[PDB]
């Protein structure tokens, strides 16, 4: 769902400076971040897999 | 160009409310502009093919 709704709020002019995400979940490391790195946004979350 | 500078353009945080955009192409009308026109931006230009 996650992955899903970054694409919506990257259409939308929400991947910017100035929105902060945190994540509830735990496979946050999963999802392919390269699409939002480079935009500024920040976005937080847990990890509990010790890599 | 101009459909490739304009993925930049998204990239960048520059297809808003806030930017307008001339082109002086007559081929703009061929641009896709699907991903383009939900955001807000302006584009204008000129078309001499009498559509």
Do not use: C, W
Request: aromatic content about 16%; overall charge negative; cysteine-free.
């Amino acid at each position: 769902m996650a992955a899903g709704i970054l694409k919506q709020a990257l259409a939308m002019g929400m991947m910017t400076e100035y929105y902060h995400y945190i994540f509830t979940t735990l496979d946050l490391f999963a999802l392919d971040v390269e699409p939002y790195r480079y935009s500024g946004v920040n976005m937080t979350g847990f990890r509990i897999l010790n890599t």
